[PDB]
Amino acid sequence: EFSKKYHVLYQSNSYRGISTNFFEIINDQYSEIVNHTNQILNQKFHYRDVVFALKNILLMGKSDFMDALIEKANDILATPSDSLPNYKLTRVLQEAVQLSSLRHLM
Amino acid sequence: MGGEIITLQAGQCGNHVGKFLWSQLAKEHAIGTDGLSQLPDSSTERDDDTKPFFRENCRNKFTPRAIMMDSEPSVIADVENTFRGFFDPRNTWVASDGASAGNSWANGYDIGTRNQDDILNKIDKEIDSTDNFEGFQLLHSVAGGTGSGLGSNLLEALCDRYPKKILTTYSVFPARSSEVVVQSYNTILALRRLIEDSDATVVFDNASLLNISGKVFRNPNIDLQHTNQLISTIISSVTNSIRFPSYMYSSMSSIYSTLIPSPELHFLSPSFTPFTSDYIHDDIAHKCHSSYDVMLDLLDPSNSLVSTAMNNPTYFNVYNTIIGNVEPRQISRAMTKLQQRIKFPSWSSSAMHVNIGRRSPYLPLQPNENEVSGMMLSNMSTVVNVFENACNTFDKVFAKGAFLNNYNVGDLFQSMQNVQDEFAESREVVQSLMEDYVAAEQDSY
């Protein structure tokens, strides 16, 4: 970024208002920055993993878990809702994650 | 998790086919010949290594959840090998109280009764490690002494003891002809128990199976050991949806529940295309998605003859198509619409569609390829013919009066084999009934 500051300052130093060159320096920084940002999202904060996961949870392509959530829950849902069901359902939710065999290894 | 399965291996064949099965699961799931994990990341929950066929020790040496019953030879071969440690010597029961099955069902059934408790202890131990039990798979041959008698005995007991679980058997049938007549005795006594006490039975017809071995593998030194490699590739493919639940439209339990029309019809036939090498040159045969799609419809490679490969004039009760390897999905749908419309299977007066297909990919722990394969598992009403044959053989044998002495001690069979007479009437009522279901009378109001 600091080099980049120096670079803008460099076109300004002998300035003639040459936008194509100023853009070029900027375009190189953009490409590098998006590619480094992909490493930062994907690798660091599992983005590629998160989209796949979203597809599993929101479009409910995670059938093992769902079968389990329903088996545990069924009894409780059949009974009209109250404040305490919410805790059991969350506990059942936690149990469902275990049941679906999803776990940390890397 | 995923609903656990216990495999019972009975007779030579089950134990042999079982050893091969284990090598194949062990490779596929990137684990050792002692189940020891692969040290760098080879599995970060990309797959779920199947707790239904495995149990985990806390050395994390995976062990198969299997009970072996036979005598010494098959178990010994595993124990010699480095395959031990993906074995359990406690699951292993070797007859020393068998004293010759003799090729007699009764003899087998009866030895099984005698050692019911020690046997039941192996099973109960295996049941007790279970989380929630999906069900059982029985691997065996019929027309055996062992393969027949002891498996039938176990099945009837399991039926009574646990009545809320699934019993599947993978059964080797002999042929739709006979050169050995007392085949028919072994097969009819066993058959009663297999019809009622199994909820599914997968028929592998040995004549048909032989054709594949002789034609495809093309080795003149061929035997059953060699053939068993073809049964293990077939058995492993059927299990793909359990071992990989990460396919979110293939999950085994629900699939099992739907396909079954009722256990009245439940003799299933497989077919498969193409073939993977195991005793012959590599599969280098690649062909198109369209080619792949055409090949599944042909039963020209007959791996079973239950009379669905002779002719199809009655109707198919259900058909399930197993696809392995990802390949363009859009194409897979356009071909699929043509298949449901074309109506390859024969049909009854109320069933005109009931054919399903599931698609799954290959694991990359295997060497990557862009060849596609698939298996067909189907239920057809044509099976009745095998019963008809069985009845012909049964009348023949009973007419000689071969070996009635062993039967007479037994209360059941005092006036000679009563059980076989009882079965003969029972099987005729079922065979007539299956025919009515092809016709209009199935819905009548």
User: What angle, 0 to 180 degrees and rounded to 10, lies between the N-to-C axes of helices B224-238 and B11-28?
Assistant: 50
∠ at Cα B136 (B166, B212), nearest 5°? 110
Spatial CB neighbours of B152, under 8 Å, sequence gap ≥ 6: B105, B108, B109, B189, B190, B193, B194, B197
Residue A93 to chain B, least CA–CA distance (Å): 15
Q: Do B233 and B280 contact (CB within 8 A), yes or no? A: no
Question: Exposed, middle or buried by CB within 10 Å (0-12, 13-18, 19+), for B17?
Answer: buried
- Phi and psi at residue B375, in whole multiples of 5°? -130, 145
> What is the interface size between A and B, counted as CB pairs within 8 Å?
32
- Phi and psi at residue A15, in whole multiples of 5°? -35, 140
Q: Do B154 and B389 contact (CB within 8 A), yes or no? A: no
Spatial CB neighbours of B165, under 8 Å, sequence gap ≥ 6: B133, B134, B135, B136
Among candidate residues A62, A78, A71, A77, the one with its CA nearest the CA of residue B132: A71
CB count, 10 Å around CB of B190? 25
The residue behind tokens 């495995």 is B54
The residue behind tokens 């299956």 is B434
Q: Is B39 helix (H, G, I), strand (E, B) or coil?
A: coil
Task: Measure the CA–CA gap between A95 and A91, rounded to whole angstroms.
Answer: 6
Among candidate residues B197, B129, B119, the one with its CA nearest the CA of residue B165: B197
Encoded tokens for B346: 């024969």
Q: Do B45 and B38 contact (CB within 8 A), yes or no? A: no
Task: Measure the CA–CA gap between B244 and B46, rounded to whole angstroms.
Answer: 10
Among candidate residues B126, B125, B100, B113, the one with its CA nearest the CA of residue B156: B113
Encoded tokens for B312: 């199809």
Task: Measure the CA–CA gap between B395 and B428, rounded to whole angstroms.
Answer: 13
Task: Measure the CA–CA gap between B162 and A25, rounded to whole angstroms.
Answer: 74
* Chain B interface includes A49 (CB < 8 A): no
In angstroms, this model's resolution equals 6.9
Q: Do B283 and B276 contact (CB within 8 A), yes or no? A: yes
Residue A23 to chain B, least CA–CA distance (Å): 41
Please indicate if the annotation marks B357 as binding a ligand. Answer: no
Among candidate residues B408, B438, B65, the one with its CA nearest the CA of residue B265: B438
Pairing mode of beta strands B200-205, B267-273: parallel
Q: Is the bond into A80 cis (omega within 30 degrees of 0)?
A: no
User: Alpha-carbon Rg of chain B, whole angstroms?
Assistant: 22
Q: Do B131 and B1 contact (CB within 8 A), yes or no? A: yes
Encoded tokens for B233: 């590739």
Pairing mode of beta strands B133-141, B166-173: parallel
Contact B248 A62 (CB under 8 A): yes
Please indicate if the annotation marks B149 as binding a ligand. Answer: yes
Structural biology method used: cryo-EM
Among candidate residues B344, B363, B364, the one with its CA nearest the CA of residue B354: B344
Task: Measure the CA–CA gap between B46 and B131, rounded to whole angstroms.
Answer: 22
Q: Is B69 helix (H, G, I), strand (E, B) or coil?
A: strand
- In sequence order, which ranges of A1-106 are alpha helices (DSSP H)? 2-13, 19-39, 47-58, 63-78, 83-99
Q: Quote the longest CA-to-CA distance of chain A.
A: 78
Encoded tokens for B100: 């010759």
Encoded tokens for A78: 């059949």
Among candidate residues B35, B256, B267, the one with its CA nearest the CA of residue B136: B256
Sign of the alpha-carbon dihedral angle for B430, B434, B437, B441: negative
Task: Measure the CA–CA gap between B41 and B430, rounded to whole angstroms.
Answer: 54
Spatial CB neighbours of B199, under 8 Å, sequence gap ≥ 6: B166, B167, B168, B260, B263, B266
Q: Is A42 helix (H, G, I), strand (E, B) or coil?
A: helix
Spatial CB neighbours of B418, under 8 Å, sequence gap ≥ 6: B412
CB count, 10 Å around CB of B80? 9
Encoded tokens for B275: 């073939």
Question: Cα B95 vs. chain centroid, distance in angstroms?
Answer: 24
Task: Measure the CA–CA gap between A58 and B16, rounded to whole angstroms.
Answer: 45
Among candidate residues B306, B130, B277, the one with its CA nearest the CA of residue B203: B306
Task: Measure the CA–CA gap between B443 and B445, rounded to whole angstroms.
Answer: 7
Encoded tokens for B237: 């493919």
The closest CB to that of B2, out of A64, A102, A103, belongs to A64
Q: Is B224 helix (H, G, I), strand (E, B) or coil?
A: helix
* Encoded amino acid at B403, one letter: F
Q: Which residues of B128-137 are buried (b: 16+ CB within 10 A; e: fewer)?
A: eebeebbbbb
Q: Do B135 and B165 contact (CB within 8 A), yes or no? A: yes
H or E segment to which residue B66 belongs: strand B66-70
Contact B248 A105 (CB under 8 A): no
Please indicate if the annotation marks B200 as binding a ligand. Answer: no
Sign of the alpha-carbon dihedral angle for A96, A101, A102, A103: positive
Q: Which residues of A touch B41 (CB under 8 A)?
A: 105-106
Among candidate residues B258, B16, B273, B275, the one with its CA nearest the CA of residue B146: B16
Encoded tokens for B54: 């495995």
Q: Is B202 helix (H, G, I), strand (E, B) or coil?
A: strand
DSSP state of B33: S
The residue behind tokens 């006036």 is B415
User: What angle, 0 to 180 degrees and rounded to 10, lies between the N-to-C axes of helices B105-114 and B146-161?
Assistant: 50
Q: Do B339 and B297 contact (CB within 8 A), yes or no? A: yes
* Encoded amino acid at B252, one letter: M
| Strand partners of residue B66 | B7
Contact B1 A61 (CB under 8 A): no
CB count, 10 Å around CB of B329? 9
Task: Measure the CA–CA gap between B310 and B192, rounded to whole angstroms.
Answer: 25
Question: Cα B7 vs. chain centroid, distance in angstroms?
Answer: 11
* Encoded amino acid at B2, one letter: G
CB count, 10 Å around CB of B299? 19
Residue B344 to chain A, least CA–CA distance (Å): 31
DSSP state of B381: G
Among candidate residues A71, A72, A70, A62, the one with its CA nearest the CA of residue A100: A62
Q: Is B320 helix (H, G, I), strand (E, B) or coil?
A: strand
Pairing mode of beta strands B62-64, B54-56: antiparallel
Task: Measure the CA–CA gap between B413 and B95, rounded to whole angstroms.
Answer: 26
Pick the residue of A54, A69, A99, A101 with the most B CBs within 10 A to test the interface with B by mutation. Answer: A101
Contact B1 A100 (CB under 8 A): yes
Encoded tokens for A59: 């479009």
Contact A105 B44 (CB under 8 A): yes
Among candidate residues A74, A95, A98, A77, the one with its CA nearest the CA of residue A86: A77
The residue behind tokens 């069902």 is B105
CB count, 10 Å around CB of A102? 16
**Integer CA distances (angstroms), B348 to B308, B378, B383, B442, in order:** 15, 16, 15, 9
Q: Which residues of B touch A100 (CB under 8 A)?
A: 1
Task: Measure the CA–CA gap between B190 and B106, rounded to whole angstroms.
Answer: 9
DSSP B324-369: ES---HHHHHHHHHHHHHHT-S---SS-S--EEEEEEPPPTTSPP-
Among candidate residues B100, B88, B90, the one with its CA nearest the CA of residue B62: B88
Among candidate residues B35, B393, B337, B19, the one with its CA nearest the CA of residue B182: B393
Range A18-27 contact pairs with CB under 8 angstroms and sequence separation of 24 or more: none
Q: Is B91 helix (H, G, I), strand (E, B) or coil?
A: coil
* Chain B interface includes A99 (CB < 8 A): yes
Write out B132-195 in H/E/C secondary structure. Answer: CEEEEEEEEECCCCHHHHHHHHHHHHHHHHCCCCEEEEEEEECCCCCCCCCHHHHHHHHHHHHH
